[PDB]
A paper describes a structure:
We recently characterized a novel roseophage, vB_DshS-[name] ([name]), that could infect the Dinoroseobacter shibae DFL12T, a ubiquitous group of Gram-negative α-proteobacteria of the Roseobacter clade. Here, we report the atomic capsid and in-situ structures of the tail machine of the marine siphophage, vB_DshS-[name] ([name]), which infects Roseobacter. The [name] virion, comprising 12 distinct structural protein components, has a unique five-fold vertex of the icosahedral capsid that allows genome delivery. In this study, we use cryo-electron microscopy (cryo-EM) and structure prediction to determine the atomic structure of the phage [name] capsid and the in-situ structure of the tail machinery to characterize the distinguished long rigid tail.
Residue numbers in the entry:
A (entry chain D), B (entry chain E), C (entry chain C), D (entry chain A), E (entry chain G), F (entry chain F), ...: 24 to 291
């Protein structure tokens, strides 16, 4: 009764405790809303000037400029297919395994494209696209403690400070900020406790680049969600040879109130 | 039924969230007064000299010098216009917007001139205009911690010492005072907990220069007011088009008592 | 007379306080299960992707991939003999001595074989056997504080980090961590107060080599025990002279779900 | 019309808040007395010595020297003259201003010349004149902690060390003291809050030189007042114009008991 | 007529304040008991070995190894004899003195020979002799900190670690520890406070050599007291000439459990 | 009427506030007595050895030695002469001055020669005289922290230590201890606070040389005070000029009981 | 009032009971089941052997061999369309009328391909496809009695015999058997009543070819129903003209448990 070829009763047990995928993290500081129709908010962007004048000499007329920000829904959506046989024989089921998979793969996609601009036309330009025009280099594969304060000045130099800001960087950067001394010979390091420079960090892997770090007042970043999550189940699109496709849509747009409330550093 | 046309009914939602353009922050620790006429205050600038003399020899006569400090009203004001159609259909009250912007841009405009002398003639002389005659250089883009002690001495050396002095430096400089140690590996940075060298700072953004830093007893500068912020709402002008014009005037002047009570930084 | 010879009725005492074996210590922070037949676990190893489209544009269908992990029993056993006379006249009860020897000499063998694979060809593949392909050399007889956090970032980069992870290193390596500072001039040593980098250490001797360390989320491995520790008395093998032979068998195997949850040190 | 040579009724508002002159400070730790005649007080120098002898072996004799210190009035005073018209039309009381100038400008002059000797014949010998003979160099534009404690030992090495002792140095030297550590790497400045090397300081401006600093028990300086301040009013002099003259006189002399109670260090 | 020679009638005063000798300290950690006959206690020295079998392959039997440690009374004596005259003329009570000098000397001799083996045959084998076989050299007159934690690791690499272990070293070594730092440029000495490396120390001079330091769990050494210290004053031995002879006997033996529970470091 | 020959009337004031000669300090930790005739005390200096015997072997009798330590009074005195006129016209009472000088000049000489041996035959052996053979050089002008702890080590290395000890060093040595670090990195000075190495310190210029320093249990030094401070007024020594002479005698000697209770520094 | 255009009273009777298609005959003797997921069944092959031992002989061991048979689901289905008009004017409920058309035409089609394999890829191989590897030629258009009894003997020799077997042939071969003798001059015909050789026949036209005759136990054919015959009404396709489409699907597979239980004729 050797187990080799004459006792091949041993088959697969197939315990259904699925090893699920590893997913990234998100953000928790910004603001949002649910609405309909186009939206526009007025912006000041201009102020009157002061004139010093002699006696009996007339002053002039100075008038402020104006402008308005706007948001229009750009739709997004993921869709997948399931043939008949897969539907017939799915061990954890295919009607429910793929269902939540779609939602969890779309929520993170939206959260990523809101932060970093998705490289595709007809897609809402992300925050990194609206502020990369003044990217601060780091003259090194990573950022020293000097630059992490430079970013804070470049934001405070524009009078945009609410003393509740946050840094954002991936993990491979957070590693270097863990094993690097703050100064020449002083005790502390850069990323001690949960803070960095008195402000919090988030350590999210959404920013794919290695040494790319972002800072600024995230409170004035608005995102317009015109609709929730749809999760439309379909059968007719593939029914000649039986099959059931799944799909889910959502539309969104991103904009920020002041262009300089965020600073973006790029590792040179 | 696309949304390009044949769908001209999309509505531009208008939300009332006007945001004032970024503004600076003032600095008040000074001395002021409301009055009329020209003004004058006498000041002693000389003292007698003691003489040691032997038995029965005549002493010498020494005479002190005097001086006075004078101020005269300098005039400054701002104004702008509003037509009729703009006033009627305005989503926020355009009147209130202008009526607030004028006062804000004048209040902020005055003290900046008080610190840094305005570039136009017929404008009052700022503190920087008077004390820049002597000015300690810095031998670098920013001020090493030792120069911040040289300022405190150069005032103490003239025995103008009061125990409530304060530093004033640009916001962009304050970044250079948090990434720099006092001494090599000494465990303390320059600006700690909103204090420097045991004295307070203000960290205003009025000082438009990079590394200029002022210091001294600011209870020794005197500004002269002749009239508060007078808001003249004017409708007789442009009355043929029924468009009113708003204007505001105020006269000011500034001069400090002891020239050696302030010092300037002048990075070079 | 004297106590030299032929005057020896002096009692010889026999106290019952055994000196023990001085074995190693365990680990025990993992998960396990009881089985039958070969087991396979499904594991999702792909994700769908979103598509940004404007009005009236089809969304592309996208699909993920799947995979599964397997386990198969490998058997480990121990056995020993005992005669009748030893049982007849034993100073402590011998059969319990040998039973406890068997049990605690098999449990520790299994623990060691889990982490480091045993040498025999018919042996379960240890964690070191699996995750050694991704190995981070140390460029020295031990590891500095740099690499000792480099492991952490090489784990957390794959999003596979849970708040409660742990380090594992040989007992002859705890001492090196103790005698070395993290950075040059600052105070503080690596093995500091029962932890190393905010995470716990275990300091076992199962790791035979000198400077091998291992870090990762220790809830991501599974050991499959097909049968508990069963004890057989086996009186019949030596009934020709009434001799028992105690033996204990057990067959297990080990595997981990996500390969990027452990990191090996392997100093060079 | 506007301000013009023709239009100028505007008056000159004369506010009587006299900005005063910036004066120096003095000392508060010495002793003195109101006197007459000429004073000589004896002080012992040296004492007898101990001798060891054999049994019935002759003993020898010794002796102890003596000495005395003396003080003689040195006369000093200041005086100025005000005309007649300037008393007729004077905005404050022109007399009282001159009186309160003379009194303080004489008190400070005497306190100045007592500490550091005045540079003129017929002037009393200041402490610097009496103790500069054994002055201690510095080998630097300023003094270092080594000398800041050598000044302490050089007083202790003469048994003249007493519990109450104080440092005295120019205000320009205090800033330098602050901007310099005590040792190489330790975190500590020379002058902490109101303390130097466990002792007090006064930090006046009387010491005209930068690097000079004095130390020692200041209870050994004795100054003698032969007469209070006179403040005599003259009218016979300058009577052809009815002009008053104000004079003050005082005689004084300074001498310290034990020459080693003070130590004086000069920069070099 | 003199004091020196042939006129010396002065009596030489005798004061009974005996200046005693100087003694050592001892040890206070280990365990002991009181017994009558020989004592043997059993310890296991060998365990079964695990095995992995190819399918259908018999597991081989593995047998443990046993041993036992024994203690036999080794007897000591200490005796001295005072004579009659020395007892008739004695300023302190001489037999009250020698009786103390015997007890203290015997206690300290037993203590010293228990720790360091006495250099004589028929003397119980001291702790040092059981572990001096393997000994960690120090490469210098004393052991630095890294060399000091090697004793910790050596016991740790034998699984014999207990929560309360201790260090023992000469008093001359305790100097070389109190005056040397743990790490260069860090504020910490080796023999800090009252502990070393987080473990207790006991300073004693029993270790006659210079830099030998011992370490290990001292609760693992046992010592046997067959009979306490007995005075046993004797007269009839030296009775021919009257005398009082004193002799104190005691018989003990020392033995160790886990040889690895003690590590010995010799300077070289 | 100027102050010259024409003004010789002004007198010469004599004030009786004399100044005492600044003296040294003493000692407050030793022990002494008042006695007559020679003195000596017995000191045990031998320990009875022990032996390990065989089964039936007699312990070999052994003996201890005894030592006797004693002292003999040495003499010492001082004397100063007064003439007749200087006694007739003395501004303070001259005999009072010399009688209050002699007693102190003798006490401070007795203590001086007790601590440090006088350099003259027929003078008592000072504590320096008895321990200078066991001196410990300093390889420099002053001693570092290493030798400062080395003295304490070499004292306690002879079982002669007790909790109440003290250092003694010249004022200059104290100043040097104040100006240096024990380890360059560590904060604090050799003379931090009132202690030096956990024990007290007393400084006094009695020790004449630069960096000699002593340490050890000071309650181990006895002083023999045979006679008080004998005062003698001698008028007949020189009556040919009617001039008396004052003499003061006192006999003393010093010895220490346990010789290894002190050690000396002798900076090489 | 005859039956012409004069009489319009008569209407179309249209009795609803439908006629039917001339469909072939099935089998209905075999086995089936309902399952899910890929399948296999463990069969046996060979067994142990019996041994006749003497009085005291041990009986020996013979190994048993094993093996399995698996099946994979092949798919099939039919579908036809229905216009909107034909659902309004259908005299029976048209969908209920077209269902039966689809279910019977599918069941019969499955019976066809199961017995004789469909000539198309992706079609489950029929019984003829599995056993035709060995079949007795006939040497003529049909088979005599000898071959029809050899078909029985070749199965009975393999012990695959069971009483309820059956022949199968095409209607034409049955007619031929009816019109011919078993042997020349023998009254009995090859086929008579319901038997051919004492066993039953089925006389179906599923075997399209002429002359092929199959024999064997038809209780060894196993077919696997992976899903009931599900009905899918489709309305999304052809939804412009409102026409709906009916569809039906199923997944089956055929495999016989004992390959030698059937034989085939295959004339020539």
């Amino acid at each position: 009764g050797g187990v080799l070829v004459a006792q091949d009763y041993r088959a697969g047990s197939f315990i259904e405790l699925l090893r699920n995928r590893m997913a990234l993290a998100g953000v928790g500081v910004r603001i949002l809303q649910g609405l309909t129709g186009n939206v526009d908010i007025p912006k000041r962007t201009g102020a009157s000037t002061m004139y010093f004048v002699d006696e009996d000499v007339d002053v002039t007329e100075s008038d402020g400029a104006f402008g308005l920000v706007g948001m229009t829904p750009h739709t997004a959506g993921v869709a997948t297919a399931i043939t008949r046989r897969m539907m017939q024989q799915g061990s954890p089921d295919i009607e429910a395994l793929v269902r939540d998979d779609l939602l969890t793969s779309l929520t993170l996609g939206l959260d990523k494209t809101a932060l970093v601009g998705h490289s595709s036309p007809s897609a809402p330009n992300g925050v990194r696209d609206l502020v990369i025009g003044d990217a601060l280099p780091f003259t090194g594969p990573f950022a020293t403690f000097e630059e992490l304060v430079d970013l804070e000045t470049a934001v405070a130099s524009a009078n945009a400070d609410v003393d509740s800001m946050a840094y954002i960087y991936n993990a491979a950067t957070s590693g270097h900020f863990k094993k690097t001394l703050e100064f020449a010979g002083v005790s502390g390091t850069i990323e001690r406790g949960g803070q960095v420079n008195g402000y919090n960090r988030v350590k999210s892997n959404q920013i794919t680049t290695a040494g790319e770090v972002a800072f600024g007042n995230w409170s004035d970043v608005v995102i317009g969600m015109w609709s929730g999550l749809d999760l439309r189940v379909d059968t007719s699109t593939k029914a000649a040879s039986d099959g059931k496709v799944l799909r889910v849509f959502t539309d969104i747009d991103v904009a920020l109130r002041n262009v300089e409330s965020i600073k973006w550093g790029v590792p040179a």
